[PDB]
Amino acid sequence: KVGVIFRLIQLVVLVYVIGWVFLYEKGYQTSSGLISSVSVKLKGLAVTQLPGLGPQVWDVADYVFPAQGDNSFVVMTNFIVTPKQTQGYCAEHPEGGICKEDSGCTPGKAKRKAQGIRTGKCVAFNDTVKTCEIFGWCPVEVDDDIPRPALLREAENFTLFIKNSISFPRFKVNRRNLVEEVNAAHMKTCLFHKTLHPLCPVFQLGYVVQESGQNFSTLAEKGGVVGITIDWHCDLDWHVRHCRPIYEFHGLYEEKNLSPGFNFRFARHFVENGTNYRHLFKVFGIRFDILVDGKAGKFDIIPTMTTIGSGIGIFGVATVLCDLLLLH
Amino acid sequence: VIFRLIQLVVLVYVIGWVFLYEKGYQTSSGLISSVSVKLKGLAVTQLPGLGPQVWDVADYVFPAQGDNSFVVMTNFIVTPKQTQGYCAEHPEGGICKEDSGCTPGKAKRKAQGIRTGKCVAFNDTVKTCEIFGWCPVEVDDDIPRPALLREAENFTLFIKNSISFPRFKVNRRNLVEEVNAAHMKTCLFHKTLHPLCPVFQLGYVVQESGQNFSTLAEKGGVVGITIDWHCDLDWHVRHCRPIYEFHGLYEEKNLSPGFNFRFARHFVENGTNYRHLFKVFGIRFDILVDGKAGKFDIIPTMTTIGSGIGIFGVATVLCDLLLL
Amino acid sequence: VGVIFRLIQLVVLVYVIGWVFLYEKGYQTSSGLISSVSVKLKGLAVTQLPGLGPQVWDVADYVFPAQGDNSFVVMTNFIVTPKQTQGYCAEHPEGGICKEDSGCTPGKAKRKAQGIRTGKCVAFNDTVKTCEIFGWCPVEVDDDIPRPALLREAENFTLFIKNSISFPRFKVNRRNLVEEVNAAHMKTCLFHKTLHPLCPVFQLGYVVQESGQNFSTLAEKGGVVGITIDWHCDLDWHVRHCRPIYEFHGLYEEKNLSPGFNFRFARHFVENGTNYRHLFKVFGIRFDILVDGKAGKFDIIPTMTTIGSGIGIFGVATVLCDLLLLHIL
């Protein structure tokens, strides 16, 4: 009965190997990619009482800078506005050259960062320091006084709405972020929590940043970067109703570096009294990147046949190894 | 000798199957691509304000540079001449009833103003609250059934895709199918008749998506174009022509249909800051590409020849075991 | 004999496992990466223009997606057609030719439309004429592309790239600014493929457009440049030895039916009581910044399964050698 016992042991080993191969979903299921489309819709307000008077309100279309969605969008969090900018010869900015007596600066564009077409003169900047005279946007920026109170910190309570639609080809199955569990009644009193309500897509910017690993009120002065990822891991063997996304906010938390924080200049032009003016904002804001990836598969007979053939081959190899070790 | 001949035949058949089915004698590469989109059309809106505007190439393609994913106007409800002031809040904020209903502070979820607290009348019979902000004129829910900025189904998209193929250092472009010189003045895109001209039509990009354009422009929608470059790159230099498959990317109807956003353009009239606010129900086009390619390399050929010889040995072992 | 054959088989197996360990990196768990970029351009250009009014294009005046978005256009040429307004005016000599008053009909001219045609014939220029259209009145004339390239001083703009990537499976975060690069280097650093390969890629037109392309003709009519950032590093060593490599692509140079890349964009304003717009046909450079990478760590499951595969391949090699010896016996 030694031979029968050995044959039974080999058969059991082969069965276990086949079960392991069919486990982990390594085989018997196809692999397909996905195509995605993401839209965002922020909703909030912000008071902007400024010592320069003229209170202003930043609406939904005033801080979302792409203003129409896109994967990578920026939400304004702070700014240094220099209104009523016009073209004309006047004093330059410091850290770009110091004028001693009509000799420090020579006519021509300066190397690397430039502020205007230098003409050559010692025009008294109203900071006890005399600099060069340039031809450009006359009221130059003053970015030293970054606003500590975080003028638009009230963005902590904004509600981001990530509407995601995907399609798996080769199965022609299309799904959306709004899973049939979430209905209209769950969109008026809905927030997002990773354990309590993991399906409703109405996130809160404060909460998103908090789960990003970045403390708020310190990246508001100089906007950081936040990355949201919507993993779509689904199996088409079961009903399509079991296709749900997983949100993971891998926030690249640094809070201290050589050049920390996002920052960009943007200007809006207009015409007043027949002269072209310009409003320039140095906006610091938090940029959200919404990366979408996934993999789904279903029953196909070719991968099943290939896996069964590989299982037969590895079972034969195992029997060869067992015979070899028994020979020794 | 019969068994040896059968084993040799099985081995050579396996080798041929490995070489010709999965194409194991060639390597693989990724894809780096750039997409440039240039719409060209016109649409006129006879708004009831006696202000007939003309919307041209720079007025409805919202990302003017034409990114990979962009948006085309198909409907709007303009709310012009907006300044900063106090007036009645939109009724979704609440209902006034008594003067004590309104409270100071912003709203909870969707704030429209500071809500200082008063009971001004928004309509002739409905009073909500008093808010300070972009107050004078507020956006409403009056989506135009005739679908203003219609006839967007006659525009001509133009995808000037480019391909890199870094490892093989072979550069290909969508525009040049090695024959395109006068097929650009008068061409369309048909999946069977003219599958090479990249001057699409928004009628022939939504229709093959499986969604009718009659209800797509009312509340917006999403359309996806793939342009996947599946080129053999081995027995040719040309024959890298891409294939297009406009994916449906979800059907219409259902909860929260379509896709609409809001944007605004500021201006100065009499020393007071103003704002033109548009709510846009525009289609969204996404262009995401992929490719594999492949070229003759000796290392993968040797690796798969070794794998084939191993498979042949395993098959011979299995046959010998079965015979015994 | 038998001992020699066993030693040869053991040596072959050892070589096989060494090859599969030091070539395919079997004891590693390859994973993707997530990424974000923040592109900041610095520079200044001045245009005279035949309008007798000098213009200065500032930091936020040429780069249009003025927040990054890893796909942006740095304007290098334009054809300004200012002071446009709604009215009935003549059409461009590309949608039709006005032989007489009956040569044009109301409609949108099918493919390419510049205005709602009315039918009347109005003289334009001197001989060509045209059909009247209701729309933006002064039609654009893009026939005369400026050869001196106007905003041609783009061979000195700096392109500070602030790339931050994260590998989630190992939960590691890295940035473009390698710890070696500090504030003392950012004051004056220029990216070079051999001498300074770590500080972010600067100076469009000198070490960015030198990808088998020439700024001379890549700014007169626009063009496309692709910067790919590869993060190929392993967390087996210290995290310090994880630095990216930049490669600039040469997608095409010239000799094409539709070369370059240009787009029309309009800036609106209101004067007196009428809405006007400035229309720019911007010819620019599209910089596609694409970042990819891969990383792995030593884990027990991959090394166990690769040692099992090595044992299997050693056994199959042994039985193949035995069969060969039997056939050659």
Ligand SMILES: Nc1ncnc2c1ncn2[C@@H]1O[C@H](COP(=O)(O)OP(=O)(O)OP(=O)(O)O)[C@@H](O)[C@H]1O
């Ligand atoms: N940030 C958000 N917070 C709360 N609800 C949101 C948010 N973004 C989107 N929604 C909801 O998404 C749905 C989409 O509908 P729709 O686009 O008509 O909304 P809306 O622009 O806010 O319109 P309305 O002016 O009619 O309230 C709405 O029911 C809206 O309440």
Ligand SMILES: Nc1ncnc2c1ncn2[C@@H]1O[C@H](COP(=O)(O)OP(=O)(O)OP(=O)(O)O)[C@@H](O)[C@H]1O
């Ligand atoms: N729908 C379309 N979108 C883009 N280009 C189109 C379209 N239909 C035709 N074309 C043709 O594409 C060609 C390449 O476009 P290109 O940007 O180089 O020219 P353009 O700015 O349109 O020139 P012009 O206005 O002087 O005809 C043009 O000659 C144009 O006639």
Ligand SMILES: Nc1ncnc2c1ncn2[C@@H]1O[C@H](COP(=O)(O)OP(=O)(O)OP(=O)(O)O)[C@@H](O)[C@H]1O
């Ligand atoms: N495109 C560029 N070319 C050259 N130097 C640049 C460029 N972008 C940024 N820098 C320099 O690198 C640093 C970036 O720091 P950071 O992002 O905090 O900017 P910043 O201090 O807000 O900039 P700025 O002073 O110009 O307003 C600064 O010292 C700046 O001079």
Ligand SMILES: CC(C)CCC[C@@H](C)[C@H]1CC[C@H]2[C@@H]3CC=C4C[C@@H](O)CC[C@]4(C)[C@H]3CC[C@]12C
């Ligand atoms: C086909 C003979 C040789 C049996 C050996 C293969 C066995 C292990 C395979 C073949 C078909 C397989 C099944 C095919 C389909 C399904 C339905 C799915 O919802 C759960 C898994 C399940 C139930 C699979 C389990 C594993 C399975 C039973």
Ligand SMILES: CC(C)CCC[C@@H](C)[C@H]1CC[C@H]2[C@@H]3CC=C4C[C@@H](O)CC[C@]4(C)[C@H]3CC[C@]12C
């Ligand atoms: C050692 C023996 C088995 C010969 C190995 C090579 C044999 C199997 C032959 C069979 C099919 C052949 C390929 C068939 C077609 C082409 C396309 C041609 O443009 C280049 C050569 C190439 C790519 C051949 C390479 C060699 C090839 C793989």
Ligand SMILES: CC(C)CCC[C@@H](C)[C@H]1CC[C@H]2[C@@H]3CC=C4C[C@@H](O)CC[C@]4(C)[C@H]3CC[C@]12C
């Ligand atoms: C025949 C077998 C058992 C011999 C040993 C094989 C395994 C255990 C060996 C072979 C190669 C080895 C690796 C080679 C190099 C390094 C880098 C070093 O910084 C940490 C250890 C690490 C990651 C080793 C871990 C152990 C390792 C994976």
